[PDB]
C-alpha cells in the first residue's frame, strides 16, 4: 500500500506516541494489525487514548471494518472510501476522523 496516512513500519506504542502527543481527539492513521496478521487498524485519538478498529481484507479485495454483533457487515471496495465515510460524524465510531497523521 500507497495512502499517505498508512504507516506500515509502526508499533502500537509508536502509534500511540504519535497520536496522543498530537493534541486533538480525531487524530488518526492506518497501521498493520499486530494481533490479526494481514489486517489493518484504523486508529483515532479520542479522550487521551487511541481507539483502534480492525480492518479485514476479504475474498475479492474488499475492506471490512470490524462492526459489533448488532451492526450490519460493513465493507468498502477500497480504503479511501472507508476513510471517507468515517470523516463524517455519527457513523459508529467513538469520534469521527479529522486529522490525518502522515508517515
Amino acid at each position: 500500500m500507497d495512502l499517505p496516512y498508512y504507516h506500515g513500519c509502526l508499533t502500537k506504542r509508536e502509534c500511540e506516541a504519535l497520536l496522543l502527543k498530537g493534541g486533538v481527539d480525531g487524530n488518526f492513521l492506518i497501521r498493520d494489525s499486530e494481533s490479526v496478521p494481514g489486517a489493518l487498524c484504523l486508529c483515532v485519538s479520542f479522550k487521551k487514548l487511541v481507539y483502534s478498529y480492525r480492518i479485514f481484507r476479504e475474498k475479492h479485495g474488499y475492506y471490512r471494518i470490524e462492526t459489533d454483533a448488532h451492526t450490519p457487515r460493513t465493507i468498502f471496495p477500497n480504503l479511501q472510501e472507508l476513510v471517507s465515510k468515517y470523516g463524517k460524524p455519527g457513523q459508529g465510531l467513538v469520534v469521527h476522523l479529522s486529522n490525518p497523521i502522515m508517515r
Binding site: 486508529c43 487511541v50 460493513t74 455519527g90
Partner: peptide
C-alpha cells in the same frame, strides 16, 4: 497499552 480495540456500532 494506551490503545482500546473497538468495534463499529452503526
Amino acid at each position: 497499552s494506551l490503545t482500546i480495540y473497538a468495534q463499529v456500532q452503526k
